[PDB]
Design a protein around this ligand. Structure first.
Ligand SMILES: Nc1ncnc2c1ncn2[C@@H]1O[C@@H]2COP(=O)(O)O[C@H]3[C@@H](O)[C@H](n4cnc5c(N)ncnc54)O[C@@H]3COP(=O)(O)O[C@H]2[C@H]1O
Length: 316
């Protein structure tokens, strides 16, 4: 199966590197065993995914690294043709913890570098082994760490060669401006990975990111409360184009310059999602899909809401 590499469909990042225009997500729900994460990642590489997105906090970096190593040994893919993203977690935002956390991720992934390393959120939490520290009342134990101070250490990780590109996740407009306007900035973020789909289409944040050559990367692209995939207008557009609702929802994002992370644990859905480059939506259908926006956030990260940098109070 032909690999969907940057050679096929890529987006140019503002540091010169290329990211494949469709990624494979690896968020693992509670109910899904880690053996299924490994199986799904192996199949994704087999059927042609080359952009693999993971995170320390998903707890499956080991399994993703095993899938990558087994695919390379089998001759499915070479390392230079893969684009691997992982993420720095809130409990390691203190500057002195950034590079050790990256090296820990690299060891778990069995990689010498990642293509993209991003701050998972703009909000830090208390350092320690627990990824979700709380007090007796269940409130999150937060920290005070300027994300610009954390950003400087991601810049150092890039200069050390441990990561090719650096970016952020779940930042809002004001927070991106803080990085872009920080004194002595070395590298702009190449991306802002956010929840984005037909019911939260991020038009305002996308406009801003485009104006700064920052790529918007979408998770929750199929809607993760209303069920996006059952939307009657979406399903009418799907029927008109002879494609599935999921493929319309992904194509909507692709045509707006967004890099979606598509994920399934079902092999047939993985392969279906790769067909997103085989059709395009008319301007009329894109306008119809624009009209579905609800500004509805399925993933509001409520565990961070007490912190002043909680990103989702502001309009964008
Ligand atoms: N071609 C196709 N036809 C029909 N259905 C299809 C399909 N391709 C995928 N799907 C289904 O769409 C569901 C939602 O995908 P989405 O990427 O929006 O949403 C993803 C992911 O973005 C979201 N999620 C939840 N918490 C998250 C977090 N903390 N970080 C990132 N993602 C999170 O949870 C979902 C996990 O994926 P999961 O496989 O359980 O659930 C998938 C999968 O069951």
């Amino acid at each position: 199966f032909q690999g969907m590499s940057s050679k096929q469909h890529c987006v140019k990042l503002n540091d010169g590197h290329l990211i494949p225009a469709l990624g494979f997500g690896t968020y693992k729900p509670k109910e899904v065993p880690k053996s299924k994460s490994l199986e799904a990642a192996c199949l994704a590489l087999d059927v042609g995914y080359r952009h693999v997105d993971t995170a320390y906090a998903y707890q499956v970096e080991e399994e993703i690294g095993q899938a990558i190593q087994s695919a390379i040994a089998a001759g499915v893919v070479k390392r230079e043709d893969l684009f691997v993203t992982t993420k720095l977690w809130c409990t390691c935002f203190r500057p002195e913890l950034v590079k050790p956390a990256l090296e820990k991720s690299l060891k778990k992934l069995q990689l010498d570098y990642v293509d993209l390393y991003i701050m998972h959120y703009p909000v830090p939490m208390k350092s320690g082994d627990n990824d979700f520290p709380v007090n007796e009342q269940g409130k999150s134990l937060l920290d005070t760490v300027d994300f610009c101070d954390t950003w400087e250490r991601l810049e150092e990780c890039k200069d050390a060669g441990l990561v090719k590109s650096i970016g952020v996740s779940n930042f809002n407009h004001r927070q991106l401006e803080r990085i872009l306007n920080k004194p002595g900035l070395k590298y702009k973020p190449v991306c802002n990975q956010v929840e984005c789909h037909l019911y939260l289409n991020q038009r305002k944040l996308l406009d801003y990111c485009e104006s700064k050559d920052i790529v918007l990367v979408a998770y929750g692209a199929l809607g993760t409360s209303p069920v996006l995939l059952n939307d009657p207008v979406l399903c009418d557009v799907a029927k008109k184009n002879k494609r599935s609702p999921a493929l319309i929802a992904l194509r909507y994002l692709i045509q707006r310059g967004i890099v979606p992370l598509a994920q399934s644990f079902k092999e047939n859905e993985m392969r279906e999602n790769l067909q997103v480059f085989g059709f395009q939506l008319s301007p009329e259908d894109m306008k119809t899909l624009d009209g579905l926006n609800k500004n509805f956030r399925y993933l509001p990260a409520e565990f961070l809401v007490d912190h002043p940098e909680y990103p989702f109070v502001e309009e964008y």
